[PDB]
Amino acid sequence: DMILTEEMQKIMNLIQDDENNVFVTGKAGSGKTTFLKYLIEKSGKNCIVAAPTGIAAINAGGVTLHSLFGIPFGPITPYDRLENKFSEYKVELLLKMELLIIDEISMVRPDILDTIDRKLRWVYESDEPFGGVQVIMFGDLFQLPPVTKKQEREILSDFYDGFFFFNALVFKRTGFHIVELTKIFRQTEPEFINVLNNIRNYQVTSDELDLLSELKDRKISSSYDNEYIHICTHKADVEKINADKLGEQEIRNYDIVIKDKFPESSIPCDLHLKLRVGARVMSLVNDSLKGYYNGMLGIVTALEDNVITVRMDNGRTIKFERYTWSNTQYTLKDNEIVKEEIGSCTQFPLTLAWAITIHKSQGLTFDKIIIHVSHTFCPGQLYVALSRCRTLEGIVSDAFITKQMIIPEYALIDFERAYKSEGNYYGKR
Ligand SMILES: Nc1ncnc2c1ncn2[C@@H]1O[C@H](COP(=O)(O)OP(=O)(O)NP(=O)(O)O)[C@@H](O)[C@H]1O
Ligand SMILES: [K+]
Ligand SMILES: [K+]
Ligand SMILES: [K+]
Ligand SMILES: [K+]
Ligand SMILES: [K+]
Ligand SMILES: [K+]
Ligand SMILES: [K+]
Ligand SMILES: [K+]
Ligand SMILES: [K+]
Ligand SMILES: [Mg+2]
């Protein structure tokens, strides 16, 4: 099924030289996550996969950056004392790590990368950036940026020119190639692709916003008994919609089981899943053999002790059983890095889905969406919402989309221009 595009080939070609660090990014729905999974499978026996959040790490089959490197919470400046001592076994592990793959790099503050650099140089007793470890980073700055507090920006401001990962001081001493994936798979309509790619970059014309005006529809947007999913900025609004529609009549509760070490912030499913016949639900896992994917929507038709029957919007009925997620850590076996399970959790891979937040929609595909617009969108939020849908016809909004809803981050525009001007490379050569 998978196509290896010229851009994907370029990435694989670059990493044949173990001195090359690489940032892989791409337009919405261009195969970043799929290609990450491909690269990991090809990445050999001294590779560690990490991500900045627990759910992202579980999804990637890796570990959190915080656990791997013992990173404290909050901003660390280059001058803050790093005394966090690793265990002997952790040191032995890191000394065998030849390649570090980081997913969702776009949400990582620059000081995090500098702390990783510092700790690896400490472990390797070396002046070489990252202790000489090869680094491959995947993300999308235009969809999934960091969220920072004012106090955090104020601490970092004396040391950093900006608050994205590429602002890390380590990139005065090393650098990375960039490959952007530009073949879009999710959308197929050139007109839709063109407006999405313009919105992505805040190069959109107030004149394209007319094409989007036809998406506004009061009746559909105010309906909750269709097969649209309501995409909202705020968790509280999503919770209210799902709770209101769930109601209190004939509800069944299904409790999570957690075994051993599995931090709550890593748990990707509901702790106490409450459903009824007729509830709109979304699948949380990819299982091609069983005929569902992460993000697939349906309606509950039956509830039993160990099976939840759901008629999916594609017409297929699926008997969902409980799914088990595995929490791992890396260890050594001989001189090779291997994974070991340290905990697990078990629950039906379903969640209520009349509504979803923009944040929880990240990376997912939908056929029919209702976008609840906001006059206080943050950068990338409208783009993420629109780019969830396969086709223009599947999108409805509750009000006209306007230029006020597209907030630019000019640092990102400048970054893109900078690396392109240097042969798709950023930092020290
Ligand atoms: N190499 C590929 N060849 C063919 N189809 C692909 C390929 N990669 C991805 N797809 C298809 O495109 C869909 C979206 O891929 P995905 O890997 O989620 O992209 P993404 O860039 O991570 N999306 P997003 O995080 O929303 O910007 C997949 O579910 C596949 O159907
Ligand atoms: K594929
Ligand atoms: K290509
Ligand atoms: K290749
Ligand atoms: K090296
Ligand atoms: K990016
Ligand atoms: K920099
Ligand atoms: K553009
Ligand atoms: K909202
Ligand atoms: K039960
Ligand atoms: Mg993705």
Side-chain angles (χ1 to χ4, degrees):
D1 270 349
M2 188 177 179
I3 294 156
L4 289 166
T5 65
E6 286 185 40
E7 289 155 348
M8 294 169 197
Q9 293 166 53
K10 174 60 172 176
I11 295 161
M12 299 307 299
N13 295 347
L14 283 167
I15 66 171
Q16 300 308 299
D17 179 352
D18 54 52
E19 292 179 338
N20 282 335
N21 303 317
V22 183
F23 173 45
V24 179
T25 191
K27 311 301 190 195
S30 60
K32 297 176 292 289
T33 294
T34 299
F35 182 74
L36 170 63
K37 186 177 178 60
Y38 178 83
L39 187 143
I40 290 167
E41 182 183 358
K42 299 295 191 181
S43 270
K45 292 189 168 61
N46 294 94
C47 174
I48 284 178
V49 175
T53 65
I55 292 170
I58 296 294
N59 288 333
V63 297
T64 64
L65 291 169
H66 300 291
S67 70
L68 178 55
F69 295 111
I71 303 178
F73 295 110
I76 294 299
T77 79
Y79 300 170
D80 283 330
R81 190 165 194 171
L82 249 47
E83 204 169 353
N84 179 272
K85 194 172 289 299
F86 293 126
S87 75
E88 295 162 311
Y89 287 132
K90 175 60 74 63
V91 172
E92 286 187 357
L93 172 70
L94 295 174
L95 286 169
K96 286 288 119 68
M97 177 181 62
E98 299 179 9
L99 173 62
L100 174 63
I101 300 174
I102 309 175
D103 196 25
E104 301 194 351
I105 194 70
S106 46
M107 77 167 55
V108 175
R109 289 196 322 267
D111 60 301
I112 298 299
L113 280 182
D114 283 325
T115 299
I116 293 169
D117 169 46
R118 290 167 73 184
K119 288 170 167 281
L120 282 171
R121 280 190 284 110
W122 183 87
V123 168
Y124 275 84
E125 300 180 52
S126 168
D127 285 342
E128 193 173 4
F130 299 116
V133 177
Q134 184 178 20
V135 181
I136 300 174
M137 299 164 286
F138 279 70
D140 190 340
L141 290 156
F142 291 105
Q143 290 193 81
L144 187 65
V147 172
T148 61
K149 303 289 177 292
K150 310 188 273 72
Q151 304 312 329
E152 298 183 326
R153 289 179 300 199
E154 284 182 332
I155 292 299
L156 295 174
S157 291
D158 284 325
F159 298 93
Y160 292 97
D161 286 339
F163 311 107
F164 294 107
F165 76 89
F166 58 80
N167 296 119
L169 302 178
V170 66
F171 298 126
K172 301 302 185 298
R173 299 192 66 236
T174 189
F176 53 91
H177 299 268
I178 300 80
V179 179
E180 180 187 24
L181 304 179
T182 65
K183 175 174 180 66
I184 290 164
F185 297 105
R186 183 177 295 129
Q187 294 85 25
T188 58
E189 300 164 307
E191 62 270 22
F192 187 20
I193 287 167
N194 288 340
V195 62
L196 287 177
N197 281 343
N198 280 336
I199 288 172
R200 177 182 177 81
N201 273 49
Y202 341 114
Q203 294 183 15
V204 54
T205 79
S206 65
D207 177 41
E208 229 152 1
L209 277 51
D210 282 89
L211 163 63
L212 303 184
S213 75
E214 69 194 10
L215 306 181
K216 187 184 84 175
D217 194 281
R218 167 61 180 160
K219 197 175 180 302
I220 295 170
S221 69
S222 60
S223 177
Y224 293 86
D225 297 319
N226 47 39
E227 293 179 1
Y228 292 77
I229 189 163
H230 294 253
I231 301 183
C232 308
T233 57
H234 297 116
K235 180 180 168 186
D237 295 327
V238 169
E239 287 176 331
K240 188 180 194 305
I241 290 162
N242 284 326
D244 284 348
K245 291 299 299 181
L246 179 67
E248 298 169 1
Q249 208 62 24
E250 298 186 26
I251 308 304
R252 284 278 301 257
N253 173 76
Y254 297 95
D255 297 315
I256 195 170
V257 169
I258 302 161
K259 182 170 180 184
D260 299 320
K261 286 128 283 137
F262 208 128
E264 171 159 332
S265 57
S266 296
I267 292 177
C269 58
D270 290 52
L271 301 176
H272 308 276
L273 175 62
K274 293 169 159 47
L275 295 174
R276 62 172 175 83
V277 174
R280 291 287 297 170
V281 293
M282 182 177 75
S283 168
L284 301 177
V285 301
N286 298 308
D287 196 323
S288 202
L289 311 188
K290 299 185 183 182
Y292 50 90
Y293 62 88
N294 178 18
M296 197 185 197
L297 303 182
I299 185 173
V300 176
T301 57
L303 295 170
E304 296 170 83
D305 287 357
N306 300 317
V307 181
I308 297 175
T309 308
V310 185
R311 188 267 187 187
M312 313 310 289
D313 292 349
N314 74 346
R316 188 180 196 79
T317 293
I318 297 174
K319 297 287 200 181
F320 284 92
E321 298 173 77
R322 289 181 173 90
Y323 183 83
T324 299
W325 288 264
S326 176
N327 184 27
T328 64
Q329 71 184 1
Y330 291 99
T331 330
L332 291 179
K333 174 168 180 62
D334 308 285
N335 289 323
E336 291 177 358
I337 292 175
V338 66
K339 296 159 73 171
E340 64 179 353
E341 180 172 272
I342 55 172
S344 64
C345 67
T346 300
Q347 175 61 287
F348 294 96
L350 293 170
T351 199
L352 290 176
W354 284 281
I356 191 169
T357 60
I358 293 177
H359 187 253
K360 287 294 198 186
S361 84
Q362 292 268 3
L364 303 182
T365 303
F366 298 116
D367 292 307
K368 293 179 174 182
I369 66 172
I370 291 161
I371 299 175
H372 291 214
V373 297
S374 172
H375 304 260
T376 59
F377 275 131
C378 300
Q381 283 188 313
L382 178 63
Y383 175 62
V384 170
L386 287 166
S387 66
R388 301 310 83 201
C389 201
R390 294 190 172 93
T391 68
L392 262 167
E393 180 55 41
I395 306 178
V396 168
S397 67
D398 61 351
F400 290 141
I401 289 164
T402 74
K403 246 195 179 178
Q404 190 274 345
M405 296 171 187
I406 306 297
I407 326 298
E409 285 272 14
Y410 288 111
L412 297 184
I413 296 304
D414 291 350
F415 170 64
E416 200 165 51
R417 287 169 180 168
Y419 75 65
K420 287 177 188 175
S421 76
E422 290 292 341
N424 297 327
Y425 189 86
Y426 187 86
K428 187 189 179 187
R429 283 205 171 267

Short mmCIF file of all heavy atoms in Angstrom, two decimals, residues 352-393:
data_model
loop_
_atom_site.label_atom_id
_atom_site.label_comp_id
_atom_site.label_asym_id
_atom_site.label_seq_id
_atom_site.Cartn_x
_atom_site.Cartn_y
_atom_site.Cartn_z
N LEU A 352 -16.34 8.70 23.33
CA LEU A 352 -17.46 9.46 22.80
C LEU A 352 -16.99 10.48 21.78
O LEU A 352 -15.91 11.07 21.93
CB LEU A 352 -18.23 10.17 23.92
CG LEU A 352 -19.04 9.27 24.85
CD1 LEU A 352 -19.66 10.12 25.93
CD2 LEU A 352 -20.11 8.52 24.09
N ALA A 353 -17.80 10.69 20.75
CA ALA A 353 -17.35 11.43 19.58
C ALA A 353 -18.44 12.20 18.86
O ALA A 353 -18.39 12.33 17.64
CB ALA A 353 -16.65 10.48 18.61
N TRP A 354 -19.40 12.77 19.58
CA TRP A 354 -20.20 13.83 19.00
C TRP A 354 -19.32 15.06 18.76
O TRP A 354 -19.53 15.81 17.80
CB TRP A 354 -21.37 14.22 19.89
CG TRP A 354 -22.52 13.26 19.87
CD1 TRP A 354 -23.47 13.16 18.92
CD2 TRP A 354 -22.84 12.28 20.86
NE1 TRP A 354 -24.37 12.17 19.24
CE2 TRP A 354 -24.00 11.62 20.43
CE3 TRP A 354 -22.25 11.90 22.08
CZ2 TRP A 354 -24.60 10.60 21.18
CZ3 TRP A 354 -22.85 10.88 22.81
CH2 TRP A 354 -24.00 10.25 22.36
N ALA A 355 -18.34 15.24 19.64
CA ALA A 355 -17.43 16.38 19.58
C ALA A 355 -16.01 15.95 19.94
O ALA A 355 -15.80 14.94 20.61
CB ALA A 355 -17.89 17.48 20.52
N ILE A 356 -15.05 16.74 19.48
CA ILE A 356 -13.63 16.51 19.75
C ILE A 356 -12.92 17.85 19.76
O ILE A 356 -13.31 18.79 19.05
CB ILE A 356 -13.01 15.58 18.66
CG1 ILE A 356 -11.62 15.10 19.05
CG2 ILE A 356 -12.98 16.29 17.30
CD1 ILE A 356 -11.08 13.99 18.16
N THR A 357 -11.88 17.98 20.57
CA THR A 357 -11.09 19.21 20.57
C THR A 357 -10.15 19.22 19.38
O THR A 357 -9.80 18.17 18.84
CB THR A 357 -10.23 19.40 21.83
OG1 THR A 357 -9.30 18.31 21.95
CG2 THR A 357 -11.09 19.52 23.08
N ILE A 358 -9.72 20.41 18.99
CA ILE A 358 -8.70 20.54 17.97
C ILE A 358 -7.46 19.75 18.38
O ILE A 358 -6.87 19.03 17.58
CB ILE A 358 -8.38 22.03 17.67
CG1 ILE A 358 -9.61 22.68 17.01
CG2 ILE A 358 -7.14 22.15 16.77
CD1 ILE A 358 -9.47 24.17 16.72
N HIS A 359 -7.09 19.85 19.66
CA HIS A 359 -5.92 19.12 20.13
C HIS A 359 -6.06 17.61 19.96
O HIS A 359 -5.15 16.95 19.47
CB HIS A 359 -5.61 19.45 21.59
CG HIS A 359 -4.33 18.84 22.05
ND1 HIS A 359 -4.30 17.77 22.92
CD2 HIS A 359 -3.05 19.11 21.73
CE1 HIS A 359 -3.04 17.42 23.13
NE2 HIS A 359 -2.26 18.22 22.42
N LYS A 360 -7.19 17.05 20.37
CA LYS A 360 -7.36 15.61 20.25
C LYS A 360 -7.58 15.16 18.80
O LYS A 360 -7.37 14.00 18.49
CB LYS A 360 -8.50 15.13 21.15
CG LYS A 360 -8.16 15.11 22.63
CD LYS A 360 -7.08 14.10 22.95
CE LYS A 360 -7.07 13.78 24.44
NZ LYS A 360 -5.92 12.90 24.79
N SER A 361 -7.97 16.09 17.92
CA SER A 361 -8.10 15.78 16.50
C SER A 361 -6.76 15.70 15.76
O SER A 361 -6.72 15.19 14.65
CB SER A 361 -8.98 16.83 15.80
OG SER A 361 -8.24 17.98 15.42
N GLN A 362 -5.69 16.18 16.39
CA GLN A 362 -4.38 16.24 15.71
C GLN A 362 -4.00 14.90 15.12
O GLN A 362 -4.00 13.88 15.82
CB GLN A 362 -3.29 16.69 16.69
CG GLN A 362 -3.38 18.13 17.18
CD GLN A 362 -2.61 19.13 16.33
OE1 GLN A 362 -2.02 18.79 15.30
NE2 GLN A 362 -2.61 20.37 16.77
N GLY A 363 -3.66 14.89 13.84
CA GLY A 363 -3.20 13.69 13.17
C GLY A 363 -4.30 12.78 12.65
O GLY A 363 -3.99 11.79 11.99
N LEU A 364 -5.56 13.09 12.94
CA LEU A 364 -6.69 12.24 12.53
C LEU A 364 -7.33 12.71 11.23
O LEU A 364 -7.21 13.87 10.83
CB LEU A 364 -7.74 12.19 13.64
CG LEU A 364 -7.24 11.72 15.00
CD1 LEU A 364 -8.39 11.66 16.00
CD2 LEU A 364 -6.57 10.36 14.90
N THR A 365 -8.04 11.78 10.59
CA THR A 365 -8.80 12.02 9.36
C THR A 365 -10.29 11.81 9.61
O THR A 365 -10.67 10.81 10.21
CB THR A 365 -8.38 11.05 8.26
OG1 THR A 365 -6.98 11.16 8.03
CG2 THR A 365 -9.12 11.34 6.96
N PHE A 366 -11.12 12.73 9.12
CA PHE A 366 -12.57 12.61 9.20
C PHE A 366 -13.20 12.87 7.85
O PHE A 366 -12.65 13.59 7.03
CB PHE A 366 -13.16 13.59 10.22
CG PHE A 366 -12.67 13.39 11.63
CD1 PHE A 366 -11.92 14.36 12.26
CD2 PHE A 366 -12.97 12.23 12.33
CE1 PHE A 366 -11.48 14.18 13.57
CE2 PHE A 366 -12.53 12.05 13.63
CZ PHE A 366 -11.78 13.02 14.25
N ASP A 367 -14.37 12.28 7.61
CA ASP A 367 -15.11 12.51 6.38
C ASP A 367 -16.06 13.70 6.46
O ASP A 367 -16.33 14.35 5.45
CB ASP A 367 -15.93 11.26 6.03
CG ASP A 367 -15.06 10.08 5.64
OD1 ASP A 367 -14.21 10.24 4.74
OD2 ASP A 367 -15.23 9.00 6.24
N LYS A 368 -16.59 13.96 7.66
CA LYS A 368 -17.56 15.02 7.88
C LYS A 368 -17.27 15.73 9.19
O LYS A 368 -17.26 15.11 10.25
CB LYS A 368 -18.98 14.45 7.93
CG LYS A 368 -19.49 13.88 6.62
CD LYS A 368 -20.90 13.33 6.79
CE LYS A 368 -21.53 12.87 5.48
NZ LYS A 368 -22.92 12.38 5.71
N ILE A 369 -17.04 17.04 9.12
CA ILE A 369 -16.72 17.83 10.30
C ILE A 369 -17.56 19.10 10.36
O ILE A 369 -17.91 19.67 9.33
CB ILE A 369 -15.21 18.20 10.38
CG1 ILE A 369 -14.81 19.14 9.24
CG2 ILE A 369 -14.37 16.93 10.36
CD1 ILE A 369 -13.38 19.68 9.39
N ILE A 370 -17.89 19.51 11.58
CA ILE A 370 -18.47 20.82 11.85
C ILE A 370 -17.44 21.59 12.66
O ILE A 370 -17.09 21.18 13.77
CB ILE A 370 -19.77 20.73 12.66
CG1 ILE A 370 -20.88 20.12 11.80
CG2 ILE A 370 -20.20 22.11 13.16
CD1 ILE A 370 -22.04 19.58 12.60
N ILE A 371 -16.96 22.70 12.11
CA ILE A 371 -15.98 23.53 12.78
C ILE A 371 -16.69 24.65 13.51
O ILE A 371 -17.42 25.43 12.90
CB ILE A 371 -14.97 24.13 11.79
CG1 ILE A 371 -14.21 23.03 11.06
CG2 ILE A 371 -13.99 25.06 12.53
CD1 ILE A 371 -13.26 23.52 9.98
N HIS A 372 -16.50 24.68 14.82
CA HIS A 372 -17.02 25.76 15.65
C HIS A 372 -15.95 26.84 15.66
O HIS A 372 -14.92 26.68 16.31
CB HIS A 372 -17.28 25.28 17.08
CG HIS A 372 -18.43 24.33 17.20
ND1 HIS A 372 -19.25 24.29 18.30
CD2 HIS A 372 -18.87 23.36 16.37
CE1 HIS A 372 -20.17 23.36 18.13
NE2 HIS A 372 -19.96 22.79 16.96
N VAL A 373 -16.18 27.92 14.93
CA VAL A 373 -15.15 28.94 14.79
C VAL A 373 -14.98 29.73 16.08
O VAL A 373 -15.84 29.71 16.96
CB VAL A 373 -15.43 29.89 13.63
CG1 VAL A 373 -15.42 29.13 12.32
CG2 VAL A 373 -16.74 30.58 13.83
N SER A 374 -13.84 30.40 16.18
CA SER A 374 -13.51 31.18 17.37
C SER A 374 -12.89 32.50 16.93
O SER A 374 -12.24 32.57 15.89
CB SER A 374 -12.52 30.41 18.24
OG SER A 374 -12.05 31.22 19.30
N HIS A 375 -13.10 33.54 17.73
CA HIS A 375 -12.46 34.82 17.49
C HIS A 375 -11.16 34.94 18.28
O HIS A 375 -10.51 35.98 18.25
CB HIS A 375 -13.41 35.97 17.86
CG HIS A 375 -14.72 35.90 17.14
ND1 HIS A 375 -15.00 36.66 16.03
CD2 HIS A 375 -15.82 35.15 17.37
CE1 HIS A 375 -16.22 36.39 15.61
NE2 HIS A 375 -16.74 35.48 16.41
N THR A 376 -10.77 33.85 18.95
CA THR A 376 -9.52 33.82 19.70
C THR A 376 -8.70 32.56 19.37
O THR A 376 -8.07 31.98 20.24
CB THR A 376 -9.76 33.88 21.22
OG1 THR A 376 -10.58 32.77 21.63
CG2 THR A 376 -10.45 35.18 21.60
N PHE A 377 -8.71 32.15 18.10
CA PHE A 377 -7.85 31.05 17.66
C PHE A 377 -6.39 31.40 17.92
O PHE A 377 -6.01 32.56 17.89
CB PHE A 377 -8.01 30.80 16.16
CG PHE A 377 -9.17 29.91 15.78
CD1 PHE A 377 -10.04 30.31 14.79
CD2 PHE A 377 -9.34 28.66 16.36
CE1 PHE A 377 -11.09 29.50 14.40
CE2 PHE A 377 -10.40 27.85 15.97
CZ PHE A 377 -11.27 28.26 14.99
N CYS A 378 -5.59 30.37 18.16
CA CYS A 378 -4.14 30.48 18.22
C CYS A 378 -3.56 30.01 16.89
O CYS A 378 -4.29 29.43 16.07
CB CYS A 378 -3.59 29.63 19.36
SG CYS A 378 -4.22 30.11 20.97
N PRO A 379 -2.27 30.27 16.65
CA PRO A 379 -1.68 29.88 15.36
C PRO A 379 -1.87 28.40 15.06
O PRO A 379 -1.65 27.54 15.93
CB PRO A 379 -0.20 30.21 15.55
CG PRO A 379 -0.22 31.38 16.51
CD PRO A 379 -1.34 31.08 17.46
N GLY A 380 -2.31 28.12 13.85
CA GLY A 380 -2.43 26.77 13.36
C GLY A 380 -3.75 26.08 13.67
O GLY A 380 -4.04 25.06 13.05
N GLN A 381 -4.55 26.63 14.57
CA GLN A 381 -5.73 25.90 15.02
C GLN A 381 -6.78 25.73 13.92
O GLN A 381 -7.30 24.63 13.73
CB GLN A 381 -6.35 26.55 16.25
CG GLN A 381 -5.57 26.26 17.53
CD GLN A 381 -6.30 26.73 18.76
OE1 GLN A 381 -6.78 27.86 18.81
NE2 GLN A 381 -6.39 25.87 19.76
N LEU A 382 -7.10 26.80 13.20
CA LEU A 382 -8.05 26.68 12.10
C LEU A 382 -7.51 25.74 11.02
O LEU A 382 -8.27 24.93 10.47
CB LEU A 382 -8.37 28.05 11.49
CG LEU A 382 -9.33 28.02 10.30
CD1 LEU A 382 -10.68 27.49 10.71
CD2 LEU A 382 -9.49 29.38 9.70
N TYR A 383 -6.22 25.84 10.72
CA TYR A 383 -5.59 24.97 9.74
C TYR A 383 -5.72 23.50 10.12
O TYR A 383 -6.06 22.66 9.28
CB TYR A 383 -4.11 25.36 9.60
CG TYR A 383 -3.30 24.44 8.71
CD1 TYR A 383 -3.61 24.30 7.36
CD2 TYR A 383 -2.21 23.74 9.20
CE1 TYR A 383 -2.87 23.46 6.54
CE2 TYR A 383 -1.46 22.91 8.39
CZ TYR A 383 -1.79 22.77 7.07
OH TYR A 383 -1.04 21.95 6.27
N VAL A 384 -5.46 23.18 11.39
CA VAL A 384 -5.62 21.81 11.86
C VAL A 384 -7.07 21.36 11.66
O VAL A 384 -7.32 20.30 11.10
CB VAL A 384 -5.19 21.66 13.32
CG1 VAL A 384 -5.59 20.28 13.87
CG2 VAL A 384 -3.69 21.85 13.45
N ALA A 385 -8.02 22.18 12.09
CA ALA A 385 -9.43 21.82 11.96
C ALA A 385 -9.82 21.53 10.51
O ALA A 385 -10.36 20.47 10.20
CB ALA A 385 -10.31 22.91 12.56
N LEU A 386 -9.51 22.46 9.60
CA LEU A 386 -9.89 22.30 8.20
C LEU A 386 -9.22 21.08 7.57
O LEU A 386 -9.83 20.34 6.80
CB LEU A 386 -9.51 23.54 7.40
CG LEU A 386 -10.33 24.81 7.61
CD1 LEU A 386 -9.60 26.02 7.01
CD2 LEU A 386 -11.71 24.67 7.00
N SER A 387 -7.96 20.87 7.92
CA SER A 387 -7.16 19.84 7.26
C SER A 387 -7.44 18.43 7.80
O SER A 387 -6.82 17.47 7.34
CB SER A 387 -5.67 20.17 7.35
OG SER A 387 -5.19 20.14 8.68
N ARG A 388 -8.36 18.30 8.75
CA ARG A 388 -8.81 16.98 9.17
C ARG A 388 -9.68 16.31 8.11
O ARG A 388 -9.77 15.09 8.06
CB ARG A 388 -9.63 17.03 10.46
CG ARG A 388 -8.94 17.61 11.69
CD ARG A 388 -7.56 17.00 11.94
NE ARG A 388 -6.52 17.63 11.14
CZ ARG A 388 -5.35 17.08 10.85
NH1 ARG A 388 -5.08 15.83 11.20
NH2 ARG A 388 -4.45 17.77 10.16
N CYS A 389 -10.36 17.10 7.28
CA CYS A 389 -11.38 16.54 6.40
C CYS A 389 -10.83 16.14 5.04
O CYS A 389 -9.99 16.82 4.47
CB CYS A 389 -12.52 17.54 6.24
SG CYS A 389 -14.07 16.78 5.68
N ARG A 390 -11.34 15.03 4.50
CA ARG A 390 -10.87 14.54 3.20
C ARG A 390 -11.29 15.43 2.03
O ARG A 390 -10.55 15.56 1.06
CB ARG A 390 -11.36 13.11 2.94
CG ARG A 390 -10.80 12.02 3.89
CD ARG A 390 -11.18 10.62 3.38
NE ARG A 390 -10.53 9.51 4.10
CZ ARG A 390 -11.05 8.86 5.14
NH1 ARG A 390 -12.23 9.21 5.62
NH2 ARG A 390 -10.38 7.87 5.71
N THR A 391 -12.48 16.03 2.13
CA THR A 391 -13.03 16.83 1.03
C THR A 391 -13.69 18.10 1.54
O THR A 391 -14.13 18.16 2.69
CB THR A 391 -14.09 16.06 0.23
OG1 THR A 391 -15.25 15.86 1.04
CG2 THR A 391 -13.56 14.71 -0.24
N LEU A 392 -13.76 19.11 0.68
CA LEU A 392 -14.45 20.36 1.01
C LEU A 392 -15.91 20.14 1.35
O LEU A 392 -16.43 20.78 2.26
CB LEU A 392 -14.35 21.34 -0.16
CG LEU A 392 -13.25 22.38 -0.03
CD1 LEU A 392 -13.04 23.07 -1.36
CD2 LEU A 392 -13.60 23.39 1.06
N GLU A 393 -16.56 19.24 0.62
CA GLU A 393 -17.99 18.99 0.80
C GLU A 393 -18.31 18.49 2.21
O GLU A 393 -19.42 18.66 2.70
CB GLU A 393 -18.50 17.99 -0.24
CG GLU A 393 -19.99 17.68 -0.11
CD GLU A 393 -20.85 18.93 -0.13
OE1 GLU A 393 -20.56 19.83 -0.95
OE2 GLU A 393 -21.82 19.01 0.65
#
